[PDB]
Subunit: 115 residues, 4 copies
C-alpha cells in the first residue's frame, strides 16, 4: 500500500466516511490521465488504491470530493474539492499517506512520506 | 499595536465576532498573572490589547473562549478554549495571532514582523 | 476588490512574499480558461486580481506556486502547488482566500463577507 | 485505550517522534492535577496513557511539548507547547484521538471522538 488517504471531519469530530476521491497521473502529453479511485471507509481511510509496481515515478493528483460529502450532511461548502498535487517516487519508492482535515470553509492536506 | 489576535470561523466562512479572550503573563511563581483582555470586533480582530512599553519579555498565554462561540451557534464543540502560549520580547516585536475555529479542531498561527 | 489572496509561511512566521499564482475560470468544455494572475506583496497579499463586473458566476481555480517558494528557501516540499477550486457568484460576493504554507502541509480557508 | 495522541511534523512530512506530553485533570479545587504522561513512538503515536476505569468524567488538559521537539531539530519555534483542553466522558465513556499537526509557527489540534 504505497498510497493511502485519511480524511477527518472537523465539524463532527469523526472520520469522514464515504468520501469519494479520484487519482490522476500526468501523462506524457501533459494531461491528467485517470489512475485510481475509491471511497473512504468507516475509519475515514482509503487503502488499496495502487501497488508498488503500478505506482511509478510521476506527478499525481488526488481530487477528494469534499463538496458531495458536505452536501450529504446538509452543508453547502466553499470548495469544489480538496486537491493534492505531488511528484512521487523520484528519489526511489516511498510510501505516502495523505491526511485531509475538512471544514466547510477550510481544509488542510498533509503528507507523511516514509522510506 | 504590539499584539493583535484574529479569529475566523471555518464552518461559516466568516470572521468570528464577539469571541472573548484573556491574556495572561507567567509570573515568577509559575502562576498566570492577568495581563489583557477583550473580544473580537465585527472583523474578527482584537486590537489594542497592550502597548510597546507594557509588553515586555515573558511567557504569555492567550486563552480564547471558543466554547461559548460554538454554544451560541448550537454546536457542541470539543475544546473548552484555545490556549496560545508563547515567549514574547529579543526586544520588542509585533505579534499577530490567528486562530481558525472548527467545532472539533482549531489551528493557530503566529506572524512576527517588523 | 472581489477577490483577495493572502499567503503565510508557517515555518518562518511571516507573510509569504513573492508567491506567484494564476487564477482560472472553468469553461463550458471543462477546460481552465486564464482569468487572473499575480504575486504576493511584502504583506503576503495579492489584491486587484479582478473587478466586480468581471468576476461573474463560475468555477474558479487559484493555483498557487508553493513549490517555487520552498525551493528558494532550500526546502524540498511535498506539493507541486496549492489548488483552491470553488464556485463563485448568488450574485457578487467578496472572497478572501488564505493559504498557510508548510513544506509537507498546507491549509486554505475562505472568508466570504459583505 | 480511551485516549490516544498522534503528532505529525509538517516540515519533514513525518510522524513527530519522541515528543513529550503531559496530561492533567482539573481537581475539585480547580487546579490542574497530574494525570499521565508519555512520549510519541516512531509512528508519532502515544498509546496507553490511561484506562477506561481511570479516565473518568472531567476536564483534561494535554500539554504537548512542541518547543523541545523543534529545538532538537535546530528550530526555534513560536509556541511553548500545543495544548488541548476538553471535557471528557460527560455523555458516557468515549474514545478520544487527539491529532496534532506541527509547524514552527503554527499548529492545529483535532479530536476524533468515537462511541
Ligand atoms: O456513519 C456515518 O456517520 C456516515 C457519515 C457520512 C456518510 C456515511 C456514513 O456514509 C455511509 C455509507 O452510505 C452509503 C449510502 O449512502 C449513499 C449516498 O452517499 C452520499 C455521500 O455520503 C457522504 C457521507 O456518507
Ligand atoms: O453557514 C453555514 O454554511 C453553516 C454550515 C454548518 C452549520 C452552520 C452554518 O450552523 C449555523 C448556525 O446553525 C443554527 C443553529 O443550528 C442548531 C443545530 O446545529 C446542529 C449542528 O450543525 C452543524 C453545522 O452547522
Ligand atoms: O525562521 C525559522 O525559524 C526557520 C525555521 C526552519 C527553517 C528555516 C527558518 O529555513 C529558513 C531558510 O533556511 C536557509 C536555507 O537552509 C537550507 C537548508 O534547509 C534545510 C531544511 O531546513 C528546514 C527548516 O528551515
Ligand atoms: O528518527 C527520527 O527522525 C527522530 C526525529 C526526532 C526525534 C527522534 C527521532 O528521537 C528518537 C529517540 O531519541 C532518543 C534519544 O534522544 C534523546 C533526546 O531527545 C530530545 C528530544 O528529541 C525530539 C526529537 O526526537
Amino acid at each position: 500500500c504505497p498510497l493511502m488517504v485519511k480524511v477527518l471531519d472537523a465539524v463532527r469530530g469523526s472520520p469522514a466516511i464515504n468520501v469519494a476521491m479520484h487519482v490522476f497521473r500526468k501523462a506524457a502529453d501533459d494531461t491528467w490521465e485517470p489512475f485510481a479511485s475509491g471511497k473512504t471507509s468507516e475509519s475515514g481511510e482509503l487503502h488499496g488504491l495502487t501497488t508498488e509496481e503500478e505506482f511509478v515515478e510521476g506527478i499525481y493528483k488526488v481530487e477528494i470530493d469534499t463538496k458531495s460529502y458536505w452536501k450529504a450532511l446538509g452543508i453547502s461548502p466553499f470548495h469544489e474539492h480538496a486537491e493534492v498535487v505531488f511528484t512521487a517516487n523520484d528519489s526511489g519508492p516511498r510510501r505516502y499517506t495523505i491526511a485531509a482535515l475538512l471544514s466547510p470553509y477550510s481544509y488542510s492536506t498533509t503528507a507523511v512520506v516514509t522510506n
